[PDB]
Amino acid sequence: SSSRKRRSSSSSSRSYTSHTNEIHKGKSYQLLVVENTVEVAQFIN
Amino acid sequence: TKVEHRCTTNKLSEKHEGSFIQGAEKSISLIRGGRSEYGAA
Fold first, then answer.
1. Nearest by CB: B1 against A6, A37, A39
2. Distances A20 to A14, A17, B18 between C-alpha atoms, Å
3. B4 CB near a chain A CB, below 8 Å?
4. Phi and psi, residue B37, nearest 5°
């Protein structure tokens, strides 16, 4: 803003600023292994 | 005499990025006969 009155005068100015960031991560891994071997597939008592 | 002149402004910006990757793997296997080292392999 600027003004003059009669001599007299005045002026003014502004900035305002705001800024924001966010970063987010989630990782999941699951492994299941179930493994069986039989080598004497039967004993019968 | 009196004079006034004025101006005002407002402004914004935004940005986004996103990613989601998801995976499943399964295996099921049976072997009968052979010898345990190679059957294992």
1. A6
2. 21, 11, 16
3. yes
4. -65, -45
Strand partners, A4: A9, B3
**Which of helix, strand or coil describes residue B39?**
helix
Residue corresponding to tokens 């004079």: B3
User: How far is it, in rounded angstroms, from Cα B4 to Cα A4?
Assistant: 7
A39: which chain B residues are within 8 Å (Cβ-Cβ)? 36
A22 and chain B in contact, CB less than 8 A: no
Written as six digits, the tokens of B19 are 């990613």
A36 touches chain B (CB under 8 A): no
Phi, psi of A14 (to 5 degrees): -150, 150
Spell out where chain B has E strands.
2-5
* Method by which the model was determined: cryo-EM
**Interface touch B3/A1, C-beta < 8 Å:** no
